[PDB]
Write a protein that binds this ligand. Sequence first.
Ligand SMILES: OC[C@H]1O[C@@H](O[C@H]2[C@H](O)[C@@H](O)[C@H](O[C@H]3[C@H](O)[C@@H](O)[C@H](O[C@H]4[C@H](O)[C@@H](O)[C@H](O)O[C@@H]4CO)O[C@@H]3CO)O[C@@H]2CO)[C@H](O)[C@@H](O)[C@@H]1O
Ligand SMILES: O=S([O-])[O-]
Ligand SMILES: [Cl-]
Ligand SMILES: [Cl-]
Length: 416
Amino acid sequence: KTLEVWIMPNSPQPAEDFKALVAPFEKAHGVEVKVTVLDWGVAWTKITTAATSGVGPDLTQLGTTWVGAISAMGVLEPVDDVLEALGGEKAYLPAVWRTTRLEGARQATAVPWFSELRAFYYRTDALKAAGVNPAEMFASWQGFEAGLARLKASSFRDPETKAPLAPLCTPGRTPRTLHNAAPWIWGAGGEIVRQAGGRWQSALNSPESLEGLYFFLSLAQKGYVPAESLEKNTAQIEADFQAGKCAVFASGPWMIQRAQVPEAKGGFAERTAAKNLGVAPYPAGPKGRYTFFGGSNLALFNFSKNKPLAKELLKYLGGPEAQVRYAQMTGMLPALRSAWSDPSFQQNPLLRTFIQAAQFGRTYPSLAGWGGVENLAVQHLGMAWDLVAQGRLTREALKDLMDKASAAINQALRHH
Ligand SMILES: OC[C@H]1O[C@@H](O[C@H]2[C@H](O)[C@@H](O)[C@H](O[C@H]3[C@H](O)[C@@H](O)[C@H](O[C@H]4[C@H](O)[C@@H](O)[C@H](O)O[C@@H]4CO)O[C@@H]3CO)O[C@@H]2CO)[C@H](O)[C@@H](O)[C@@H]1O
Ligand SMILES: O=S([O-])[O-]
Ligand SMILES: [Cl-]
Ligand SMILES: [Cl-]
């Protein structure tokens, strides 16, 4: 007997860690779990091709923001039974519960696996050298910009690179997601989409969304993000932070784990950044404090030939033992609320900051059209980063680009 599972790179050795996670299950049931690791860049294509073709695994990892879209194609097995066996609605943060289904759908189609949310890594040595108190820098938009100005004026040089650090690293290539931009949209009192009388519309071109997006993109145009960074993607910016080229960088809790792993094993423990590593929440914007809260769920294709066994594996991977173990392996947080209280998560001072930041966590709505909405948004946001790189992003040009984005998004949303 065989189960196939598709996962994304959640840990330093994704396949080996997942095999070690499921070895007790394999023994107890007399079964082999075969795993295939999909890059996040190609996962959507691979998963939607399995969905329409009927050729795929028994289980796939799904990003929380994708559950609605894949569920709407009618290809996922109901898993309300698994969720009831895991403790039902009360066993999960409501934000997590809402990712188990397409908004407004009758049955659940995904089991929560892990949660993640975004905060700022910072170089503790660089902020001390600049005279920046992270408590002031990360409290407010004004404190954020004031600390980036101090980091820009700093005479600090990395002790390995013998070079200055960039104040902020953020990618300017066409993003794959709005994860980096969302907290600035939200902090200004904006939204990506808004429901009015049942129907979803873009709000990327609202005055509030434009204020937040402009604030964020203009940090790079004011010189706090180097030119080189706007020609880089997330993976390259992450490597730059790890190699000691950036003072401040937004990411998920996984990087805490990677900071404790040797380079040999796909970590960065030997690097100065790992030994001078701090974490602070996103600053409060004028309409409050938000950060992106996501993670990944597991779903069972309705064409699987091993549904009963597959659901046993969903109950295993969703349950307390596997939930704590996999969070430990990945640096992610458990999707199961009770597992947050495990003392292993409360003892890393950096992870404790992620946990506290979850009070301001915000999710995308679970829409059928989400894949197309985010794809359309990031294509237009890619062009606004192109203007930034030329010093030509004006409020007017950003409004023009978000009006186009909003037309495209409203036209896609009318197709559901
Ligand atoms: O949008 C869909 C989905 O996104 C989820 O967020 C994902 C990001 O999409 C993804 O790009 C990000 O990828 C991380 C990966 O998790 C890490 O393991 C990896 O970390 C190491 C890695 O071990 C090495 O192999 C790699 O080469 O280098 C890095 C350096 O430390 O870093 C990548 C790149 O950022 O992971 C996110 C979390 O899963 C949301 O969570 C979800 O809600 C969305 O639906
Ligand atoms: O940053 S100035 O263009 O508002
Ligand atoms: Cl961005
Ligand atoms: Cl939103």
